[PDB]
Design a protein around this ligand. Structure first.
Ligand SMILES: O=c1[nH]c(=O)c2[nH]c([N+](=O)[O-])nc2[nH]1
Ligand SMILES: O=c1[nH]c(=O)c2[nH]c([N+](=O)[O-])nc2[nH]1
Ligand SMILES: O=c1[nH]c(=O)c2[nH]c([N+](=O)[O-])nc2[nH]1
Ligand SMILES: O=c1[nH]c(=O)c2[nH]c([N+](=O)[O-])nc2[nH]1
Ligand code: NA
Ligand code: NA
Ligand code: NA
Ligand code: NA
Lengths: 295, 295, 295, 295
């Protein structure tokens, strides 16, 4: 036998950081969950019980905290790049570092209509994420995403004209509910190293904002022919607004809301134009995926 | 043997309802999860296999949908009361109906700064809930609550002066992080029936708003001596602002954020005044509860 | 305002303990999650910022570990009683201790048909739990339970003869699937203190075994008229086999498995006697509860 | 813009099937969760609102049920292959079908020491899974796995000899707890189509059994130098016992159990040889991965 691939490290490392402005007394918080997995000349830890090649996962944890103490943790694309670069530079025999970061929302509270200097609310489980792969000799590959953005529109969604055969029971519709949990990923041009990442730092928050904005406005305004057709419109716009992105990927569940026929009870009319009460379906769910690039 | 208590029904019933304004084309959505459990002269279904006394749980489900079709689903205190009253009035041998409702957030989107007529976002897993107990002969008992309201303040929390003995290791602190998930319940005066609930309908949305407002402002502004002391201030204010509430109950976890001593590494200073990076602790957690009534 | 009720403490305390037999080298492990909440003369911590009355939740945590070091952690009824008694005896102003314990399964592995001396498997998320309320002046109240015991029978379940009216659509059936997650609780006679708990120690493991045994055999063998009728048979038998239990409570979801009519496709017959493929329903679910005492 | 990749279908489809032996009255149940995602000449559904190319996800659902009615659902490698083959053969423009199956445990109960003909228990959340990729022109690629197999050993685990530098605080140990959730995957030789899968049907249950057996025995018996070294031994043995597997992949968290120093309390000795009570850590966790192939 032989090792064909191997990576190891520390997962589920929770990290908080606070910034305190001395002049103003305004505090800002950041919270994330970090995973760092390393690759390199480590195969003998598996095949020969040779632990000398192992940077202990506890030491990886410590390094995450130390790196957060010594550097900005925002934007997460930057933090991830600093962190991954550290491992491949510090350790001769480590040749790749795979950094995943989940950013949690802590939005400043407004109290009596004024922003509070040190109080925050979790306004949803929507996450902002990065996957940063720092590979010796091959730069830094970054995938940025937003996830857990849960939306619903109550009309201006359709689904008709699909293939019909002996497996088909679904009725065509010209007016349905559409709800989803948005998972959207933009894949950056390869960066040659940490300096090139640094050179683009403002583009990370701006592109996340654009992606979110485009997603919400297109979802709200598209008189949707399908999840397929709507998500493609989102991706095309994001590509048109950031040249340093190569692809945009969406993964969208169709979280079904079924009509409830109540005509068996006192002739109640609750279908078609009279539909008011629906049964949200937990499972199953359609799942629609696309990766969009430039022509 | 003998039945000492029994209740049965349908849990986890997901319900959506849409309202469409003909004049304006503005749509409004509501979504909930409903549980209805019945009590009455039903013991023989347990002891003698006598199903004649059972209103099938599937029929309870149907009734939930029908009731939602024929009535407003908001405020949930009202809907719950209508629903519970139905069962004790329709069925001679059913003498109590226990209705729990979880309301899910669907907040109207603002697109390009204008509210959208039919598009919504789940801005957090914060819930608004009711527990409505409709008991034949004894009116309607309602507990209203908000839950899953997750907050953090980065300073203006203290904890010192606690009991110290041979079990104590915790250091006193004059400046710590405080984070919690707020579960707040206001218990209404008993209502004599559905008419009295109806008579108070505007008070339900107003009292939920007050409770939320008081919670957030007191959390943000209190230079907190303890979770105990802060939650009591919240409860006292809510009681002072709605005479028809008898008690306010809080259940608050203390979601700990631990300092990380990094002085072992290059003499890094990350404790006390220099504390910037912290380790959020998933477990264990303090749990602090209070029920506050009037003097 | 005034405090009407208050309790506070530490939740979600994970605890492992190992026993090592010197003679034999056989190791045995125990793992639990513990919550301890205290009541007493603590109201001034809420109303007057007086922390002097607070046994810190961190100290409660420490005490859990210390108590586990100095005492058997099994049966959990005993451990819980020792732990709760400690708090009301150690602290004059603490008058009740509420101890909840969740026991996790670590079943010894059999390797090559022989039990292994120090290797274990989690054979399900079924839990064994206790709720121990130690109240100064009023002894020790214990509720023991098993939960998360998930079972299915593929026939010998019926449901017919239920009430039929204008809300009813459910078809009567003489042969259906029955599946549930068993939550069964036996409530002990009040104990006057820790000595009386000690005096009954063998009865705790024996009664848990009986409850589990009765549950499984009655579920498997009862040609069930309803969940109501089957759960009552379980409760009656457990009461008949342990005189020191006062009541047995069951809480059982009916986790529905729906037939799928496929006759629209090539006349496939998949209903009634020909039913082979079913759709398990995640929600909604019937919920059936009973508390059984002695006549 | 242009579509670079696209797949769509139905996720989270719950499926039960029962087999009834007429001769004997012995019933056997199977339960799974299925996802089917299709690829093909479908890009115009995204770019041009052309739904004519869409096999509706509801029809995919129906097809899953129909296929389960007409074929064995075990072993899941076979069922998955039948299902995926159907889609690429039935639809000219569909060129790949990606089938994921999660199999849930329903183990026959033994009652009074005899196996019951129609009653079952969920003995853990351990799953048996397949990923079956049926690609037109390129056969059938199958990855089989077991997951959620949670184990603990209380001794005969070590971790010393790892790299030590200025980021390192972890103490070397010669006797620690090791616990993990086993995720093990065996990747089959490419199959040319459904006939070749059929030809190997007995090997699927046998290889799953071997993988489970090897995993448990090696975990229990290895005086472990590291998770790395132990998991490699498991993989090598599985490869040696099934020539039709090309690689074995493990993904193992190190679910840490920390010592608790209690010497601050009455000089209690709970570390090293005296360690009895430990704190299980929910997060963070080491994460160790390997893909092993043949030399
Ligand atoms: O937008 C949609 N795309 C699909 O591919 C689809 N398939 C189904 N369906 O049959 O339920 N609804 C759908 N809605
Ligand atoms: O506000 C608090 N109340 C408490 O009762 C408490 N106990 C502990 N503690 O020891 O960690 N922190 C606490 N903080
Ligand atoms: O055992 C049962 N008890 C019930 O009370 C019940 N109600 C319904 N039902 O209508 O679905 N099934 C049921 N099955
Ligand atoms: O088996 C192990 N492998 C590792 O790579 C490792 N790293 C750490 N650690 O530092 O905690 N424990 C570990 N245990
Ligand atoms: Na390197
Ligand atoms: Na009645
Ligand atoms: Na006391
Ligand atoms: Na094809």
């Amino acid at each position: 036998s032989a090792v064909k691939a191997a990576r190891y490290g520390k997962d589920n490392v929770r990290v908080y950081k606070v910034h305190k402005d001395e002049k103003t007394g305004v505090q800002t918080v950041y919270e994330m969950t970090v995973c760092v997995l390393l690759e390199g000349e480590i195969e003998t830890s598996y095949t020969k019980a040779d632990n000398s090649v192992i940077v202990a996962t506890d030491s990886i944890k410590n390094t995450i905290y130390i790196t957060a103490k010594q550097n900005p943790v925002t934007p997460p694309e930057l933090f991830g790049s600093i962190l991954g670069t550290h491992f491949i530079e510090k350790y001769n025999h480590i040749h790749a570092a795979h950094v995943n970061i989940v950013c949690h929302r802590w939005t400043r509270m407004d109290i009596d209509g004024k922003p509070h200097p040190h109080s925050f609310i979790r306004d949803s489980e929507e996450k902002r994420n990065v996957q940063v792969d720092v590979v010796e000799g091959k730069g830094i590959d970054i995938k940025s995403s937003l996830s857990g953005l849960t939306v619903l529109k109550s009309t201006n969604s359709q689904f008709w004209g699909f293939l019909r055969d002996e497996y088909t029971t679904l009725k065509e519709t010209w007016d349905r509910i559409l709800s989803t949990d948005v998972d959207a990923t933009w894949q950056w041009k390869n960066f040659s190293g940490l300096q090139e990442v640094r050179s683009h730092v403002p583009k990370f928050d701006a592109t996340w904002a654009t992606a979110r904005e485009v997603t919400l406005k297109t979802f709200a305004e598209d008189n949707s022919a399908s999840v397929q057709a709507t998500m493609y419109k989102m991706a095309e716009q994001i590509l048109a607004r950031q040249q340093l992105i190569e692809t945009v990927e969406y993964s969208l569940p169709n979280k079904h809301y079924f009509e409830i026929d109540l005509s068996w009870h006192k002739g109640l009319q609750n279908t078609g134009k009279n539909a008011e009460v629906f049964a949200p379906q937990s499972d199953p769910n359609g799942l629609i995926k696309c990766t969009v690039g430039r022509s």
